[PDB]
Structure formats: C-alpha cells, structure tokens
Amino acid sequence: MDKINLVCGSLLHNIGKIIYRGTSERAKHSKLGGDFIKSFEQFRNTELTDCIRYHHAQEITSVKSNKEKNSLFYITYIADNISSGMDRRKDLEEGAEGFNWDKKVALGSVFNVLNEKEKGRQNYSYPFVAEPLNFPTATQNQYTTSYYDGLITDMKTILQRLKPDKEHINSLLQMMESLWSYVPSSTDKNQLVDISLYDHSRTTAAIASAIYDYFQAENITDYQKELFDYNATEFYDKNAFLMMNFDMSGVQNFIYNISGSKALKSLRARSFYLDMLLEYISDNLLEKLELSRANILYVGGGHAYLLLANTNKTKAILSDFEHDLKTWFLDKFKIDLYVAMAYTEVSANDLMNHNGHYRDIYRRLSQKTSAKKANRYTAEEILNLNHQGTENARECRECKRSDLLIEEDDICEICDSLQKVSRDLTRENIFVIANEGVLDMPFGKKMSALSYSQADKLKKSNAEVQIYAKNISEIGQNLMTRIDMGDYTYRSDFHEMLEEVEVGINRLGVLRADVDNLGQAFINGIPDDYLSISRTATFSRAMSRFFKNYLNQLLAEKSYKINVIYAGGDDLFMIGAWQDILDFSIVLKQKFADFTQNKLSISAGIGMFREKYPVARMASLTGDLEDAAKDYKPDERTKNAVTLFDATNVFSWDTLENDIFVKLDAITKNFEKLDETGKAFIYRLIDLLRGVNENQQINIARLAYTLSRMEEKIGKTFAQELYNWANADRKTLIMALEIYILKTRE
Amino acid sequence: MKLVIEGTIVLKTGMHIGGSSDFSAIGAVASPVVRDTLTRLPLIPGSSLKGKMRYLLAKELNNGIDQDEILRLFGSSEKDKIRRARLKFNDIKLSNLAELETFNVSSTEVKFENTINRKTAVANPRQIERVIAGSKFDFEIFYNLDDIKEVEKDFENIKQGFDLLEFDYLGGHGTRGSGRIAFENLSVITAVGNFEKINTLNEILGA
Amino acid sequence: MKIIKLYFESPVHFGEKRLSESKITFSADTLFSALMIEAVGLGKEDEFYQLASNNLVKFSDAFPFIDQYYYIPKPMFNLKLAFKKLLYVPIDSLEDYLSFNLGKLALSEKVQQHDFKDSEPYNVGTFTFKENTGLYVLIEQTHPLLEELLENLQYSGIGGKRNSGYGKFKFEILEDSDIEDLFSAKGNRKILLSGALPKDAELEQALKNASYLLERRGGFVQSDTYATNLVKKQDLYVFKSGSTFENSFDGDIYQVGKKGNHPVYKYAKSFFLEVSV
C-alpha cells in the first residue's frame, strides 16, 4: 500500500485507450490495459493492476466486496475524476459494447478554446507525424491504427527496462511525454478531446499522490465506503491540496551584469544557471517531500507551480525548506536574487471549477506571493545583513559583489564558476549535480556539467546525484532528468560568421520578441465552461514546448545564421547576421501565429549593430526597440509590431511582412536586371523621399520629374509604381529602399 | 568661499564634439553631435572642457616629472595623493540661439568628408555633424576657495589653461580643421561669502 | 513643514550601484552626507551632527514634483487586493486611492583618452529634468544652519558625476499649506518616506504587518582625510522610502565604517506619513 505503486498505476492508468484504438479486440479497454501490463516482462503486482484495471466507478461498484478496503485504486478513480474538471458518475467507458463510437479521432488543441469570447473558438486538430513540428491544421485529421500499433511497439520496447522503482518515475513520465503527447484522452465526446493523454495522466498521477499523502497524514483507511456507500461530495469540500509556487526575483539584473570581453557567453551562463537552478530546487523539494515530478505542473521562466497535500508534515517541510533556501541566497546573492515560496490551501471542488473558484486559486497564490515578496525577511536576516563583516574582500570586475576574490584575474567566484561552466556548455549536452563540483547550488550540491562518457560511469546507483540533460537516446539505459533549453549556436563566434556573410553590410542583428499578454492569457485567456487543471497544464506545456523546441527546429531546418540565448514568452534574445535575423523574424511570426492559431501574438525589436559593439548596450538598445514595439498603436486610442533598427520605424507584422517585403522584392527584381541605375539613383531617390517630411510639395514634384526623366531605363511600369508608392505610403518604401541598399552593400 | 568663473566660448571653427549611440540611416550623419536630451540644443559637456583643459595644463606645466598644482584644480583619487577638486565644471548649453535665428541659420551643420585609399583611389564618404562657427557658449565654473594663499597661482593657472585652449581644439576631429575656440568676457564673481581680493582675480582674467 | 524645492539647470547622475545607470531621486543618505561635506569646509560639522542627532533637523529624501503637484513613491501597501504601472503617486491624492513623466534618462558616453595607448570609453547615466520640474525634500523646523548649508551646496553640486559636470541646482526653501496638514493629520497605517533603518531594539516590532523593500546603501567614503585611500564603507541595508508600517519607529545616524580619521555617517532616520487604511 505504498504510493510508488500508486503513482505508477495512476500513470499507467488509461493505457488501455491507445491499445483499444489500435488493436483488433473491442472489449472494455481497462481489461485491455490490465492484461497488456500483466503480460509484460514481469507479472506486476496487484497494486498496479487494481489501479489500471479497476477504475471508473461503474466497473468497481459491480465487484466491490471482494475488492479490499484501503485498496489504493479509489484514490486513482477520484484523481481521474478531478483531473478532467469531469462528472464521471453516470457516463460510461469507451469500449463498453454500447454502440458505434469513434475509433480514430485526432487530438484537438487548447489554443482553439483560448480567447473564445474575443478571438473566436476555432476547431483544429493535430495530425500525427512519425518533437516533429506539428502545428494545428483545420483539416479533419485521423490517426490510422498503424500509428497506435507503432506506439504499442515503441512503449513495449521502452518499458522493458522499466520496472516500479523510485528512480523510474521520471523515465516513465518522459516515455509518456514522448509517446502520448498527441494521443487524445477523450474520444467521440465534447471538446474534452483537446487535452493529451500524457497531460491528463500526469495530472491524475499528481492528484492521486497528493490524495494519498493527505489520507496517510489525516488517518483515513476506510475510504472505499466514503467514496461509494456514501457519496464523496463531503470529500470534495475538504481543503486537501496545496498548490505552491516559486518566483525568482531579480533575474534580469542578475543576467545583465555583463562586461566587455566574454560578455555574451556570460549572459548564456547566467540565464541557464538561473533557469536550471530553479528546476533543481523545484525537484529537490519533491525529493525531500517524497513526491514524483508529476506534481510539478510547470517550471517556466523564474516561476514553478507545484501541487502538494495540505498536511502539517508538508507545511513543516515547506517552512524548514524555505528557511534553508533563503539562507543560501542571502549567503551569496544578498538582496539581489531571492525566491519567494508561498502556497494556498485548495480543495477538490475548485480544482474541478465546480462552484466557481478556479481562478481564485491563482489569485490567492499570487496575492500570497506578492505578500511574500514584500515581507521577504524576518528580523534575523536583516540583523545579520547589517552586522555582516569579512576579510579584505575587494569587488568582482564582471560581477559587482564584495566577495573574496581569486588570483591573477582579481574577480568574484560566482563570476568565475559561471565562466568555467560557460566553457563547459560550449558543448550543450549533459549536466550533473553532485555533492562536489565547480558551480555552487543549494543545498551543498555543486554542478560540474561534465560530458556523457564520465557521466556513464558516475551513476554508480548513488540515488542522490541527479543528471540533467537535453538529449535522450535510449530511455532505460540513461535514467536521467530532461531539461528544456534553446541553444542553437550556429558558429559560437561572430568574426568568422560575419565574415562569411557575403553581399551585405557586416552588421550584427539582435532580436527580442516579447509575447503580447501571455500573463493575461494565463490568467483568464481560457473560458470558464472549458476550465480545468488539465487545460491549464497543457496550455503552458504548449507554449514552453514551442519556445524551447520548435524554434530550435526552425533554426536547424533552414540553416539561419542566428545564435539564440533565451527561450520563452517572457523574453527572447537572438543575435546573428542581420539579414538572417530580418528574414527569420517574419517566419517566426508566421509560425507562432500558426502554432497558436492566431490567438497569441509577439512584439519584436530588431537592431543593427557593429560587430564589436558592447553586448550590454546591444541588449539594452534592443530592449528599447522592444518596448517601442509594445507601445505601438494607431492614433485612436493593435500591440503586435516589429521595430526596425531605430525607435521611429515601428511597423506592424502585417506591414513588414506584406508592404515592406513586397516592395523590397519588387525593387530587388527590377534593379538586378539593370546594370547602371542603382545605387546612385536609389540614393538620390531616398535623398528626396526623406526630404518630403520637411518640404512636401517641391520634393514630390522633383520626384515626379526624376521618375519621368529616368523612366527611360527602369521602365514605365516600375516608375509609375515607384511614384504611386512614394505618393501613398512613403514611410514603407523608404524602409524598403534602405534595407535593399543595406542588403546590396559592397 | 565659492567663486564663480564666468565666461563665453565662441567657436572659430566647427567643433564637432561628443559621441552618441543613436542609429544612423544610410545617407545620414554618422557620429552626430551631443545635444541636451530635452531642449536639443547643441551642448558642450563639462567633462570635455575639463579634460581638454587638464590635458593642456598638464602638457605645459609638467616637463618630464603630475605635481600638485593640477591635482588641486582638477582632483585626484590615487593611492596617496587624494585631493578634492576645487573647480566644478558644468554642462555648457548653446547661448546665442537668438543671434543665429537673426542670421537665419540653424545651430548646427552637416560636414561632408571622405577618405581616399592610396591603393585603389576609391572614396569613402562620411557625414559628421558639427556646430556652426560663430556660436557662443556661456559657461560657469565654480571655484571652491578654501586655501586663500594659493588662489592667485590657481587663477593664473586657470587663465593659462584658457589661453592654451585658445590655440587648440575643444573636441572631435580637431587636427582636420575643427574645434578652434576663443574665450571672451571672462569674469569672476563671489557666489557665497565676500572675498576681499576679487579685483586681483578679475584682473588676472580680465586683461 | 517647509519644502526644500530644488530646480536643476543640469542633467544629474544619482547612482544606485553602477555609473552607467541613474535614478531620478537622491536618497536622504546622499543629502545628509552632502550637507555634512559642506559643513566640514565651514568648520561646523559637529553643530550639524548634533543638530540632526537631537532630531532638530529631520528631512526626507528627494521626491519628484511637477508644476503645482508633489509626488511620492508608490506606497507598497499590504493590500488584500492600466493603473498597475504607476511608480510615483501624488501626495495630495493618497487617501482616496485606497499621465506622469518628468524629463527623460540618458547615457552620456565618455572617454579617458591617452596619447600613446588607446582610449578607455565609459558611460555616465544622466537624468535631465524638464524646465518646470525638479526634486523636493520635506523638512520640519528649518534652520539657519540648514538655510546656509544649502547655499553652499548649490555651488558644489549634488549627485554623482559632480564635479564634471552634473550636479547644479538652485534651491528655494518654501512653505506649503495643504501638505503640512497631511502630516498633522493621522490615520492607522504609517508609510515611510526616508531611507530608514530601525534600531535593533525596535526592529522586531517595527516589522509586524510591515510591507517593505530593503535597499542596500554602501559605496566608498568621499573624503581626502579618511586614511588616505578611497575605501569602501560597510554596507547598510535600509528600508525603501515607499514602504508602509503598522508600528512606527525612529531610525538612527549610523556610523558606517571601521578605522579612519573621522566618523562616516549615514542618515537612516525615518519620516512617516500616517494615512488610514
């Protein structure tokens, strides 16, 4: 009756759905999952088989008395009921020999329900591709039974090395992540098809483990009767869950403490350090609290929503965890970096949005987290901060901390550890967190960030040294935790990279691309009739999946000369050849509006910089171009726009991708066949087009005279359209001509 | 006692000054001149005037030695000879914009330059934005009198720095024909306190 | 309650931790240390120190003001609760709270040039007020020593990249009628308007329903007589001047510094604006 077999059963719950949708037998899919798993390499114990085979209340109210009290599957049944947010008291299970119901239906999307009352409710689907770029297309896709049979063979070949152990839970989870991400949990129903099988299984595993921890701290054993002989509407009122979050504070002021030489590599080092440090502390609280990584709902940029059990054991563990974490931050990053741990008490009605109160979980959590950010120290921290003293302790040159320095270079040690790991992450493959190493992390666990050869030996079944890596070849042999990051280094240097840009001006291009109001879409972008923990999980899953995998795919598939550093809707930071930055911004917009299916938008700012410009000033100036794009509007009273190289050239994505780019391609088409006219004629054209602002009428007349005078060589059609564009939209053709001359320099 | 050294810099040439991170278009001024961030008048920073005066004074007064007659004027923060700076330079803005609109000219011009490669004889045109010549610049340099014994030598040294700056440029592309300034209407007036021997200071300058 | 209104003729640099950046207000640490640097030239350092230490002269930090309006930083109330981004709020309308920009920031790029090695560029972050705009410092019970210490400070400048050349102002000690009875009147939650640090005997009751934000105050001492070396003074973590409280305290003039030739002081007294919430 331990919860490890419970979380394994709750994860392997609804494995019968895929093999019902694939195979030949048409029975109750719960039986199919049960004998599928019992006919594996081991006949797994009854603890798994009652969770897998015996759920779905109609199936277990028939055979009940032979089944035990304290039987560990009733909590799986109620976790499956709560994760859908559905009302499964009367509704049947697919494959109950009822009638003709569908077999091959495609997964929906959480982006079509998103922003329903303004941006409409579309109805798209995810076609199957045999981590492929799968954007939703409105054509009605169907998964053929060979896809499910291939899924069966893949999970058979993966699960053979996987048996119920404490270290196999994350490997089984990432197996579910790789396989069932495009398997719909619902079939032939309402719009419950839009949640994946993996996301619903992760949510029901987290809720099942939390319910068991609540039961084993609040002394409930006869829970079969208070589910079934008396209905559990009284349990739904019980505040049985916590939902905790982290917020890192001061992330931007930390990652932008950069310098002269080795500026950009230090920014990668600090951004990666803070993100993976947040991932490690969010995993380590689950390790101290004896939970799986399914209880994590999201670990994004600077924040980490969890889900726990409302027990005094959990509250005590949270308090003496956050004291140690606060002491470790105030040991090194004195008031600069701080993480805030606040948690609300949440019942079972409001995870279903039953009587309302779903969004108030997030509201109470953010109010408590803002209250923690205000009242962030007790008197002991403040008193020790005031009384704190040291040795000589000069200041870092790249960082600025009054810490003890090191020899021959006279710098901070956080600065130096970030430098050495930044040398290690020039090969971005695998990171190790052991009790000794080069980069300090709490609690007394230092990274080395080694390579895969010395990390194969290092796992001696130590059961404490966690290995984080981005690449997974074989699931069972590795047994490590997967971490997302956007890391496409085209060259890792810019001298040779900007030397092999042939026909343009050798300038760096920097891009920023904030997402327009992802916070508001996170809070109330999804309507109340379709609101549950599954959709709130899978929507953040979808956006993190895009920004940490899909743009890596996009940079790889057409070899754009772009180095990427950040990843997320919070911020992005790409630097590379300016022609590739400008030619990639539009396709990033088009593929973001195809992934989010015209629901979420972006706001980029592009800047042209010289190759040896300070990277801190490059980032600050393109942040100015970013917020110039986010402040874009017409005269009354549209926030998606791109800022090109200067704060006054603010065009929307429609204007850049259509008007500027069609004009530029027409100018490039009509000025490559002529061997004389540009660029002297084009410079004399710009010299009066930019003079229309100060002297309007005479420059328009001189434009007319020049175009009719020298239409003898460029053609009467091109001169007429140059005059008509220069009379209608002058602001656009000036930008098109400027980019054309910058692209044809030398 | 705080004395105010008041005067006026008149430009006998262009005097391009200062640097900006501002973006330049293709046919447009690269390296524009520094301006005030609100009024957009052309501006001489106090740091540029201070550094050029220190450069000329330390070039002349030192003969292969810095001794203290420059550190007492401009300050130092070295390891042992720390001195509080007596002179307090200020950011100088354009004074006679009313004069330039009488002559129907703006406050600044665009100078067109290029370079010729000696191997391929190709030009390389640049546009540098200078202040126009004949624009006055009214400044105020606050002097902090605390050693009444050496105010005579310090104001002699300030006048020597002014008349050494009368023969060199004030900033920017100085060797290639810009930057030439001239000082006029130099006068000293006690701000707080009442200094007795202000006539000898105003006769060191006002001559 | 007199008003030390400051109109600025120059861009100013009030550094926080780096030269490249600048904030728009100077703290009361800077104002007290500036006034006492002006006092040591007059030979009246101890009179000013005992004038502040006996709570006779007590001033806030700088707050922005525009034409006819006086602003203060956003009181971080411990509420149970666009208008989301308003970093400064007026002092007249705070009770009913329960559009704005002054000048712009800039970064004036500079060099240290040399003849026979290449130059060393650096940046100084400025802030230029508008022509109808500046900062004001609240003061209770003005003093002729205070009235003349501002008269020397306007000819030596306030801020960072003084002396070359950024701090230049012209004060007017002014007296107001609708914001002395904002301090005579009282409510139940006491917001802070100075860079205060409660003493160790009252900190644990100062922070009971407090909603603060600690700001570190450090840096190098600015004197040519303190041990003949530009040496950092020990960092003092004070509350921000936009924090609120439930139990009022009184700060102190902390002497931040080890061995040296004179006591390096730091104004960490408080100045509360009691309001009802």
PDB file of N, CA, C and O in Angstrom, chain C residues 118-167:
ATOM      1  N   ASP C 118      45.542  53.322 -26.345  1.00  0.00           N
ATOM      2  CA  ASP C 118      44.204  53.624 -26.831  1.00  0.00           C
ATOM      3  C   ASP C 118      43.307  54.100 -25.695  1.00  0.00           C
ATOM      4  O   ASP C 118      43.541  53.800 -24.522  1.00  0.00           O
ATOM      5  N   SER C 119      42.284  54.866 -26.057  1.00  0.00           N
ATOM      6  CA  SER C 119      41.396  55.487 -25.092  1.00  0.00           C
ATOM      7  C   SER C 119      40.520  54.443 -24.411  1.00  0.00           C
ATOM      8  O   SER C 119      40.341  53.332 -24.904  1.00  0.00           O
ATOM      9  N   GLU C 120      39.980  54.812 -23.254  1.00  0.00           N
ATOM     10  CA  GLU C 120      39.123  53.925 -22.470  1.00  0.00           C
ATOM     11  C   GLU C 120      37.733  54.522 -22.367  1.00  0.00           C
ATOM     12  O   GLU C 120      37.498  55.407 -21.527  1.00  0.00           O
ATOM     13  N   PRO C 121      36.781  54.077 -23.184  1.00  0.00           N
ATOM     14  CA  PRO C 121      35.437  54.656 -23.136  1.00  0.00           C
ATOM     15  C   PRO C 121      34.667  54.169 -21.920  1.00  0.00           C
ATOM     16  O   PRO C 121      34.889  53.063 -21.428  1.00  0.00           O
ATOM     17  N   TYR C 122      33.759  55.007 -21.441  1.00  0.00           N
ATOM     18  CA  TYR C 122      32.898  54.681 -20.323  1.00  0.00           C
ATOM     19  C   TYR C 122      31.631  55.499 -20.438  1.00  0.00           C
ATOM     20  O   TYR C 122      31.571  56.468 -21.191  1.00  0.00           O
ATOM     21  N   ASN C 123      30.615  55.098 -19.695  1.00  0.00           N
ATOM     22  CA  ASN C 123      29.317  55.736 -19.767  1.00  0.00           C
ATOM     23  C   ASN C 123      28.960  56.343 -18.423  1.00  0.00           C
ATOM     24  O   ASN C 123      29.328  55.819 -17.372  1.00  0.00           O
ATOM     25  N   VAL C 124      28.246  57.459 -18.469  1.00  0.00           N
ATOM     26  CA  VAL C 124      27.694  58.093 -17.282  1.00  0.00           C
ATOM     27  C   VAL C 124      26.208  58.276 -17.520  1.00  0.00           C
ATOM     28  O   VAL C 124      25.809  58.988 -18.446  1.00  0.00           O
ATOM     29  N   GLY C 125      25.386  57.618 -16.707  1.00  0.00           N
ATOM     30  CA  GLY C 125      23.951  57.710 -16.855  1.00  0.00           C
ATOM     31  C   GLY C 125      23.461  59.011 -16.266  1.00  0.00           C
ATOM     32  O   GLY C 125      23.719  59.308 -15.100  1.00  0.00           O
ATOM     33  N   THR C 126      22.767  59.791 -17.076  1.00  0.00           N
ATOM     34  CA  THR C 126      22.299  61.095 -16.651  1.00  0.00           C
ATOM     35  C   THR C 126      20.803  61.038 -16.411  1.00  0.00           C
ATOM     36  O   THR C 126      20.161  60.001 -16.576  1.00  0.00           O
ATOM     37  N   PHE C 127      20.258  62.177 -16.006  1.00  0.00           N
ATOM     38  CA  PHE C 127      18.818  62.380 -15.950  1.00  0.00           C
ATOM     39  C   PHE C 127      18.549  63.868 -16.050  1.00  0.00           C
ATOM     40  O   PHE C 127      18.967  64.626 -15.173  1.00  0.00           O
ATOM     41  N   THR C 128      17.857  64.285 -17.102  1.00  0.00           N
ATOM     42  CA  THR C 128      17.570  65.693 -17.335  1.00  0.00           C
ATOM     43  C   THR C 128      16.121  65.960 -16.959  1.00  0.00           C
ATOM     44  O   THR C 128      15.210  65.363 -17.532  1.00  0.00           O
ATOM     45  N   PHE C 129      15.910  66.854 -16.001  1.00  0.00           N
ATOM     46  CA  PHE C 129      14.562  67.266 -15.657  1.00  0.00           C
ATOM     47  C   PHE C 129      14.025  68.213 -16.717  1.00  0.00           C
ATOM     48  O   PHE C 129      14.760  68.722 -17.563  1.00  0.00           O
ATOM     49  N   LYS C 130      12.728  68.457 -16.661  1.00  0.00           N
ATOM     50  CA  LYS C 130      12.166  69.466 -17.535  1.00  0.00           C
ATOM     51  C   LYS C 130      12.375  70.851 -16.929  1.00  0.00           C
ATOM     52  O   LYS C 130      12.897  71.005 -15.823  1.00  0.00           O
ATOM     53  N   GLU C 131      11.961  71.876 -17.671  1.00  0.00           N
ATOM     54  CA  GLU C 131      12.216  73.246 -17.241  1.00  0.00           C
ATOM     55  C   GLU C 131      11.270  73.696 -16.137  1.00  0.00           C
ATOM     56  O   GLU C 131      11.531  74.717 -15.491  1.00  0.00           O
ATOM     57  N   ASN C 132      10.182  72.968 -15.907  1.00  0.00           N
ATOM     58  CA  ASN C 132       9.199  73.288 -14.878  1.00  0.00           C
ATOM     59  C   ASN C 132       9.160  72.251 -13.759  1.00  0.00           C
ATOM     60  O   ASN C 132       8.153  72.094 -13.067  1.00  0.00           O
ATOM     61  N   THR C 133      10.264  71.531 -13.583  1.00  0.00           N
ATOM     62  CA  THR C 133      10.279  70.277 -12.848  1.00  0.00           C
ATOM     63  C   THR C 133      11.574  70.204 -12.045  1.00  0.00           C
ATOM     64  O   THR C 133      12.585  70.794 -12.431  1.00  0.00           O
ATOM     65  N   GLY C 134      11.531  69.505 -10.915  1.00  0.00           N
ATOM     66  CA  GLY C 134      12.737  69.194 -10.172  1.00  0.00           C
ATOM     67  C   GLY C 134      12.487  68.198  -9.062  1.00  0.00           C
ATOM     68  O   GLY C 134      11.623  67.330  -9.186  1.00  0.00           O
ATOM     69  N   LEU C 135      13.231  68.307  -7.971  1.00  0.00           N
ATOM     70  CA  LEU C 135      13.015  67.475  -6.803  1.00  0.00           C
ATOM     71  C   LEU C 135      12.702  68.356  -5.611  1.00  0.00           C
ATOM     72  O   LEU C 135      13.061  69.533  -5.585  1.00  0.00           O
ATOM     73  N   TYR C 136      12.037  67.779  -4.619  1.00  0.00           N
ATOM     74  CA  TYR C 136      11.804  68.469  -3.363  1.00  0.00           C
ATOM     75  C   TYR C 136      12.146  67.563  -2.197  1.00  0.00           C
ATOM     76  O   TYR C 136      12.022  66.341  -2.288  1.00  0.00           O
ATOM     77  N   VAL C 137      12.587  68.173  -1.105  1.00  0.00           N
ATOM     78  CA  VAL C 137      12.910  67.470   0.126  1.00  0.00           C
ATOM     79  C   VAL C 137      12.045  68.057   1.226  1.00  0.00           C
ATOM     80  O   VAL C 137      12.063  69.271   1.459  1.00  0.00           O
ATOM     81  N   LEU C 138      11.274  67.205   1.881  1.00  0.00           N
ATOM     82  CA  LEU C 138      10.490  67.613   3.029  1.00  0.00           C
ATOM     83  C   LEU C 138      11.398  67.898   4.207  1.00  0.00           C
ATOM     84  O   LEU C 138      12.416  67.238   4.399  1.00  0.00           O
ATOM     85  N   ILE C 139      11.031  68.901   4.993  1.00  0.00           N
ATOM     86  CA  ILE C 139      11.790  69.238   6.187  1.00  0.00           C
ATOM     87  C   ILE C 139      10.813  69.782   7.219  1.00  0.00           C
ATOM     88  O   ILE C 139       9.858  70.484   6.879  1.00  0.00           O
ATOM     89  N   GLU C 140      11.010  69.395   8.471  1.00  0.00           N
ATOM     90  CA  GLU C 140      10.307  70.007   9.585  1.00  0.00           C
ATOM     91  C   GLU C 140      11.280  70.912  10.329  1.00  0.00           C
ATOM     92  O   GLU C 140      12.452  70.555  10.497  1.00  0.00           O
ATOM     93  N   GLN C 141      10.801  72.104  10.710  1.00  0.00           N
ATOM     94  CA  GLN C 141      11.511  73.052  11.575  1.00  0.00           C
ATOM     95  C   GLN C 141      12.868  73.447  10.984  1.00  0.00           C
ATOM     96  O   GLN C 141      13.923  73.001  11.437  1.00  0.00           O
ATOM     97  N   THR C 142      12.802  74.228   9.901  1.00  0.00           N
ATOM     98  CA  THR C 142      14.000  74.655   9.183  1.00  0.00           C
ATOM     99  C   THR C 142      14.939  75.467  10.073  1.00  0.00           C
ATOM    100  O   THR C 142      14.552  76.007  11.112  1.00  0.00           O
ATOM    101  N   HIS C 143      16.195  75.532   9.658  1.00  0.00           N
ATOM    102  CA  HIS C 143      17.259  76.044  10.486  1.00  0.00           C
ATOM    103  C   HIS C 143      18.148  76.983   9.681  1.00  0.00           C
ATOM    104  O   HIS C 143      18.364  76.745   8.489  1.00  0.00           O
ATOM    105  N   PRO C 144      18.649  78.063  10.288  1.00  0.00           N
ATOM    106  CA  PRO C 144      19.583  78.943   9.567  1.00  0.00           C
ATOM    107  C   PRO C 144      20.893  78.271   9.179  1.00  0.00           C
ATOM    108  O   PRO C 144      21.468  78.622   8.139  1.00  0.00           O
ATOM    109  N   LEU C 145      21.375  77.308   9.976  1.00  0.00           N
ATOM    110  CA  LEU C 145      22.475  76.453   9.533  1.00  0.00           C
ATOM    111  C   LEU C 145      22.071  75.621   8.322  1.00  0.00           C
ATOM    112  O   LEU C 145      22.846  75.480   7.370  1.00  0.00           O
ATOM    113  N   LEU C 146      20.861  75.063   8.341  1.00  0.00           N
ATOM    114  CA  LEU C 146      20.352  74.361   7.170  1.00  0.00           C
ATOM    115  C   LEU C 146      20.097  75.320   6.016  1.00  0.00           C
ATOM    116  O   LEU C 146      20.313  74.961   4.854  1.00  0.00           O
ATOM    117  N   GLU C 147      19.654  76.542   6.320  1.00  0.00           N
ATOM    118  CA  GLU C 147      19.385  77.525   5.277  1.00  0.00           C
ATOM    119  C   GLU C 147      20.669  77.965   4.583  1.00  0.00           C
ATOM    120  O   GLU C 147      20.648  78.319   3.399  1.00  0.00           O
ATOM    121  N   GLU C 148      21.801  77.932   5.286  1.00  0.00           N
ATOM    122  CA  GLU C 148      23.032  78.353   4.632  1.00  0.00           C
ATOM    123  C   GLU C 148      23.842  77.171   4.116  1.00  0.00           C
ATOM    124  O   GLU C 148      24.707  77.356   3.256  1.00  0.00           O
ATOM    125  N   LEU C 149      23.593  75.960   4.621  1.00  0.00           N
ATOM    126  CA  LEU C 149      24.280  74.792   4.078  1.00  0.00           C
ATOM    127  C   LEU C 149      23.749  74.440   2.699  1.00  0.00           C
ATOM    128  O   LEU C 149      24.457  73.843   1.885  1.00  0.00           O
ATOM    129  N   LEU C 150      22.498  74.792   2.423  1.00  0.00           N
ATOM    130  CA  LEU C 150      22.003  74.678   1.062  1.00  0.00           C
ATOM    131  C   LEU C 150      22.576  75.771   0.176  1.00  0.00           C
ATOM    132  O   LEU C 150      22.628  75.618  -1.049  1.00  0.00           O
ATOM    133  N   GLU C 151      23.009  76.883   0.773  1.00  0.00           N
ATOM    134  CA  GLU C 151      23.554  77.980  -0.016  1.00  0.00           C
ATOM    135  C   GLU C 151      24.968  77.679  -0.490  1.00  0.00           C
ATOM    136  O   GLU C 151      25.401  78.204  -1.519  1.00  0.00           O
ATOM    137  N   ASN C 152      25.704  76.851   0.237  1.00  0.00           N
ATOM    138  CA  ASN C 152      26.985  76.392  -0.272  1.00  0.00           C
ATOM    139  C   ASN C 152      26.847  75.188  -1.183  1.00  0.00           C
ATOM    140  O   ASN C 152      27.689  74.989  -2.061  1.00  0.00           O
ATOM    141  N   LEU C 153      25.808  74.375  -0.985  1.00  0.00           N
ATOM    142  CA  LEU C 153      25.678  73.132  -1.739  1.00  0.00           C
ATOM    143  C   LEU C 153      25.272  73.398  -3.181  1.00  0.00           C
ATOM    144  O   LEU C 153      25.589  72.607  -4.074  1.00  0.00           O
ATOM    145  N   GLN C 154      24.604  74.521  -3.439  1.00  0.00           N
ATOM    146  CA  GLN C 154      24.228  74.838  -4.811  1.00  0.00           C
ATOM    147  C   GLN C 154      25.418  75.268  -5.655  1.00  0.00           C
ATOM    148  O   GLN C 154      25.308  75.299  -6.883  1.00  0.00           O
ATOM    149  N   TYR C 155      26.547  75.587  -5.034  1.00  0.00           N
ATOM    150  CA  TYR C 155      27.768  75.913  -5.749  1.00  0.00           C
ATOM    151  C   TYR C 155      28.816  74.815  -5.655  1.00  0.00           C
ATOM    152  O   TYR C 155      29.954  75.022  -6.081  1.00  0.00           O
ATOM    153  N   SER C 156      28.456  73.657  -5.104  1.00  0.00           N
ATOM    154  CA  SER C 156      29.288  72.467  -5.153  1.00  0.00           C
ATOM    155  C   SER C 156      28.560  71.255  -5.697  1.00  0.00           C
ATOM    156  O   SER C 156      29.208  70.244  -5.969  1.00  0.00           O
ATOM    157  N   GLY C 157      27.250  71.317  -5.839  1.00  0.00           N
ATOM    158  CA  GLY C 157      26.510  70.320  -6.588  1.00  0.00           C
ATOM    159  C   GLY C 157      26.155  69.101  -5.767  1.00  0.00           C
ATOM    160  O   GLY C 157      26.819  68.749  -4.795  1.00  0.00           O
ATOM    161  N   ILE C 158      25.085  68.432  -6.189  1.00  0.00           N
ATOM    162  CA  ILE C 158      24.585  67.233  -5.530  1.00  0.00           C
ATOM    163  C   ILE C 158      24.504  66.142  -6.589  1.00  0.00           C
ATOM    164  O   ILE C 158      24.243  66.429  -7.761  1.00  0.00           O
ATOM    165  N   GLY C 159      24.819  64.919  -6.212  1.00  0.00           N
ATOM    166  CA  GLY C 159      24.737  63.824  -7.149  1.00  0.00           C
ATOM    167  C   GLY C 159      26.096  63.201  -7.370  1.00  0.00           C
ATOM    168  O   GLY C 159      27.026  63.434  -6.612  1.00  0.00           O
ATOM    169  N   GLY C 160      26.184  62.398  -8.422  1.00  0.00           N
ATOM    170  CA  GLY C 160      27.377  61.607  -8.603  1.00  0.00           C
ATOM    171  C   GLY C 160      28.472  62.181  -9.468  1.00  0.00           C
ATOM    172  O   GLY C 160      29.553  62.430  -8.961  1.00  0.00           O
ATOM    173  N   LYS C 161      28.236  62.481 -10.737  1.00  0.00           N
ATOM    174  CA  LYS C 161      29.358  62.811 -11.610  1.00  0.00           C
ATOM    175  C   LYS C 161      29.682  64.309 -11.586  1.00  0.00           C
ATOM    176  O   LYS C 161      30.377  64.831 -12.467  1.00  0.00           O
ATOM    177  N   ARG C 162      29.165  65.019 -10.588  1.00  0.00           N
ATOM    178  CA  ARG C 162      29.936  66.058  -9.921  1.00  0.00           C
ATOM    179  C   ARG C 162      31.359  65.549  -9.710  1.00  0.00           C
ATOM    180  O   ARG C 162      31.564  64.456  -9.180  1.00  0.00           O
ATOM    181  N   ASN C 163      32.369  66.314 -10.118  1.00  0.00           N
ATOM    182  CA  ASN C 163      32.328  67.722 -10.432  1.00  0.00           C
ATOM    183  C   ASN C 163      32.189  67.989 -11.916  1.00  0.00           C
ATOM    184  O   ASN C 163      32.204  69.137 -12.332  1.00  0.00           O
ATOM    185  N   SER C 164      32.085  66.947 -12.733  1.00  0.00           N
ATOM    186  CA  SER C 164      32.368  67.097 -14.158  1.00  0.00           C
ATOM    187  C   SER C 164      31.278  66.517 -15.047  1.00  0.00           C
ATOM    188  O   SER C 164      31.359  65.356 -15.447  1.00  0.00           O
ATOM    189  N   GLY C 165      30.256  67.307 -15.371  1.00  0.00           N
ATOM    190  CA  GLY C 165      29.759  68.379 -14.535  1.00  0.00           C
ATOM    191  C   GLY C 165      28.263  68.207 -14.520  1.00  0.00           C
ATOM    192  O   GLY C 165      27.601  68.484 -15.508  1.00  0.00           O
ATOM    193  N   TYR C 166      27.728  67.772 -13.405  1.00  0.00           N
ATOM    194  CA  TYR C 166      26.339  67.341 -13.466  1.00  0.00           C
ATOM    195  C   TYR C 166      25.463  67.876 -12.345  1.00  0.00           C
ATOM    196  O   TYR C 166      24.311  68.223 -12.587  1.00  0.00           O
ATOM    197  N   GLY C 167      25.973  67.977 -11.133  1.00  0.00           N
ATOM    198  CA  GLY C 167      25.119  68.495 -10.089  1.00  0.00           C
ATOM    199  C   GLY C 167      25.055  70.004 -10.090  1.00  0.00           C
ATOM    200  O   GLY C 167      26.029  70.661  -9.738  1.00  0.00           O
TER     201      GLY C 167
END
